Amino acid sequence: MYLTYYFIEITIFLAILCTIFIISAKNPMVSILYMIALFVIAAMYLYLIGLGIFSLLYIMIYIGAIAVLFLFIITLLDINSTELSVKSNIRDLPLVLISLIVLTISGLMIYSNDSILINKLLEAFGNDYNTIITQDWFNIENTTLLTTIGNVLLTNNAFILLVLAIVLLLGIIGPISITMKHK
């Protein structure tokens, strides 16, 4: 039954692997194919954490539209591309080996509130403690997640949906602003 325990750390390792196959590929289509693999590893993680609704929204729009968009572009366009050769990309290695260390450790620094700079990092890993889940009987109707998003976009944050209309408006005007050549 504790085969079913490491499921999150598995998908973390798979995401590491999958980005290694993003940035090291021969064809430009092989990279987007591992990218839709990355979206579906992400959507598995999002179901895994307790968010079943999002995972399917990620399938709808991220291996939905923008996938088809990128596959489409790479079809009807020619793009020269070289290979990941050692003679053109080993010169970047001593900068990558610094920036990996620094950017990861610093991206794990700000979740803490001490002022020691070593107790800040060691609170990112020192969390093996199991949260206790109680049952409260206060909720009466199945206001799931999507109901509350539809209540907050529409009443409390109606202006963000209404500026959002202008952004999608601009996403329609823009490609017709460019790619038409009127008359």
Binding site: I61, V68, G150, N151, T155, L164, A165, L169, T179
Partner: protein, 108 residues
């Protein structure tokens, strides 16, 4: 072990089996495009994506009574003017040169 998950584990096995029987039994062994073709997919995305902005309203339509209504109506009515932009500008129509321009024959 519920009955949902054998199915989406068992189908890739069915596909792999129908594929391995094919590998067992088979025989083996830039041009320019129009702007309308690229534009259908580029412009498809802001019309697929207002739909998912419309998805949270349709679940919570009872709660936002009389007020989330008008917010959604205004959202759609802001989207319709960009729609009428693209249909006023004849954006998807692809044109060709088959007309002789119908100029009358002028003499001397």
């Amino acid at each position: 072990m519920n009955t949902f998950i054998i199915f989406i584990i068992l189908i890739p096995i069915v596909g792999f089996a129908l594929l391995a029987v094919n590998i067992l039994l088979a025989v083996y062994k830039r041009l320019a495009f129009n702007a309308a073709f690229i534009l259908v997919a580029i412009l498809f995305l802001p019309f697929d994506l207002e739909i998912s902005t419309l998805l949270p309203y349709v679940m919570s339509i009872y709660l936002v009574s009389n007020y989330g209504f008008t917010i959604v109506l205004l959202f759609l009515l802001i989207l319709i003017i960009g729609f009428v932009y693209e249909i006023n500008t004849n954006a998807l129509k692809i044109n060709k040169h088959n007309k002789p321009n119908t100029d009358s024959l002028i003499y001397k």
